Design a protein around this ligand. Structure first.
Ligand SMILES: Cc1ncsc1-c1ccc([C@H](C)NC(=O)[C@@H]2C[C@@H](O)CN2C(=O)[C@@H](NC(=O)c2ccnc(N3CCN(c4cc(-c5ccccc5O)nnc4N)CC3)c2)C(C)(C)C)cc1
Ligand code: NA
Lengths: 115, 143, 91, 84
């Protein structure tokens, strides 16, 4: 992993800065910092492995991701969490689905165009 | 001792920076603790997603001078009636000419050199005592 | 609106404020008739109390930096003030 | 109603009331002289006086009171010696 982190950075940097085409909102801001235990006890209990981006940001910093395929299934787990806690069709729900295909479409561009 | 209430009830809020400083929005973590949020250019304003009952404190991001929001010391998001985002007008106070003269001096000399002025031995205390975040908290919490 | 100005005459000076649209106030304070008076930058001003028409809009004659006006039957250079020391610790 | 290295200046009485020290010399229990302060500092002082009243508790977007760097040392001792 010589610049493996450097490419994970771009990937996460791109997903967060994603803007809706009609609304323009950053569409990732709900998921940035997950509220605390004292302040949301029912999330941490219903959800097996809670995760938000701040943890992924600093998990990348510890470079505990051996692979990009490793990095994906965390960001994948992140939306899979929000899809269970939230109602099908709720704003948060339908957006976690969007970012799934945002991380999808972004992984292809980064890996190739840098050898 | 002084922090935000955990009502999950949201509150669309918007900060209008109507002052020449660079404003530093400060959220108060539920342990009384302050957490900082991105700075605001002087003329501009920005919309936010805050939650009702929370506490916001406002402050220059460079001198940490006392900044005024909505004409009062602090700002708590009320409920937005017709969806109208609540306005946190971040403006200046009217400092005492003593205080205003204090800020300009801190801007022109480094701390390792304050004491070399040929000025009153009292003002040295008044200079070396800088405007602080948590310090102003103990002052507001006191009664 | 409200314009804040500054009249000087041989180092004696008045701070007061009036509307964007005169000297009569001088007669009450200086107890000298108003017609004997009054200009800026060598351009007397006859028709008094029209304030703005000369350049004193609500942004130039503001409290933290008032606008200078002179007073006259004699012409005079109102005596300026002292100069700053520029102590060397700063900068 | 109204009131070189001395005072020599006239302002409204209420604008004078701004400073706490000058709420003491006159009307105790007119003219007032200052044997320390120059004539260039008293400009920026009574400018703060007018700047104080017009803007205090007026919800309008308050602008800064300005200070030239070559003036700071001597206004500060003043506003210290003025309780304002
Ligand atoms: C000021 C400023 N200038 C310039 S830019 C800017 C600015 C700063 C911050 C913000 C963010 C967006 N906004 C806040 O910072 C607000 C402003 C302050 O009042 C407080 N605040 C907080 O964020 C704190 N607290 C809470 O958010 C909190 C508390 C109690 N309950 C809460 N809920 C119930 C559960 N929710 C759900 C979450 C998820 C989910 C999330 C992540 C990953 C997976 C998931 O599944 N999924 N589904 C949900 N339903 C969320 C809402 C939230 C903080 C502790 C998190 C920092 C925006 C703009
Ligand atoms: Na957030």
């Amino acid at each position: 992993p010589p610049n493996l982190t450097k490419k994970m950075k771009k990937i996460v940097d791109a997903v967060i800065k994603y803007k809706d085409s009609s609304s323009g909102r950053q569409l990732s801001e709900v998921f940035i910092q997950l509220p605390s235990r004292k302040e949301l006890p029912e999330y941490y209990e219903l959800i097996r492995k809670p995760v938000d981006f701040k943890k992924i940001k600093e998990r990348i910093r510890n470079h505990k991701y051996r692979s990009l395929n490793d990095l994906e299934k965390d960001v994948m787990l992140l939306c899979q969490n929000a899809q269970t806690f939230n109602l099908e069709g709720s704003l948060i729900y339908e957006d976690s689905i969007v970012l799934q295909s945002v991380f999808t479409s972004v992984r292809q561009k980064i890996e190739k165009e840098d050898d | 001792v002084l922090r935000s209430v955990n009502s999950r009830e949201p509150s669309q809020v918007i900060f209008c920076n109507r002052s020449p400083r660079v404003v530093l929005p400060v959220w108060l973590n539920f342990d009384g603790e302050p957490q900082p949020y991105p700075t605001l250019p002087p003329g501009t304003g920005r919309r936010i997603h805050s939650y009702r009952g929370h506490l916001w404190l406002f402050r220059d991001a460079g001198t940490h001078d006392g900044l005024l929001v909505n004409q009062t010391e602090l700002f708590v998001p009320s409920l937005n009636v017709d969806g109208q985002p609540i306005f946190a007008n971040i403006t200046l106070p009217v400092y005492t000419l003593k205080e205003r003269c204090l800020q300009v001096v801190r801007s022109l000399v480094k701390p390792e050199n304050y004491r070399r002025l040929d000025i009153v031995r009292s003002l040295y205390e008044d200079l070396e005592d800088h405007p602080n975040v948590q310090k102003d908290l103990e002052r507001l919490t006191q009664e | 609106m409200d314009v804040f100005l500054m009249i000087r005459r041989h180092k004696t000076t008045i701070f007061t404020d009036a509307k964007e649209s005169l000297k009569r106030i001088v007669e009450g304070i200086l107890k000298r008739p108003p017609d004997e008076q009054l200009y800026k930058d060598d351009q007397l001003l006859d028709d008094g109390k029209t304030l703005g028409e000369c350049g004193f809009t609500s942004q130039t004659a503001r409290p933290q930096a008032p606008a200078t006006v002179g007073l006259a039957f004699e012409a005079l250079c109102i005596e300026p003030f002292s100069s700053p020391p520029e102590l060397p610790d700063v900068m | 109603m109204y009131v070189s290295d001395g005072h020599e200046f006239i302002v409204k009485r209420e604008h004078a009331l701004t400073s706490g020290t000058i709420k003491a010399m006159l009307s105790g229990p007119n003219e007032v002289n200052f044997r320390e302060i120059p004539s260039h500092v008293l400009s920026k002082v009574c400018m703060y006086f007018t700047y104080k009243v017009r803007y205090t508790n007026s919800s309008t977007e308050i602008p800064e009171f300005p200070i030239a760097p070559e003036i700071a040392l001597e206004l500060l001792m003043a506003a210290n010696f003025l309780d304002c």
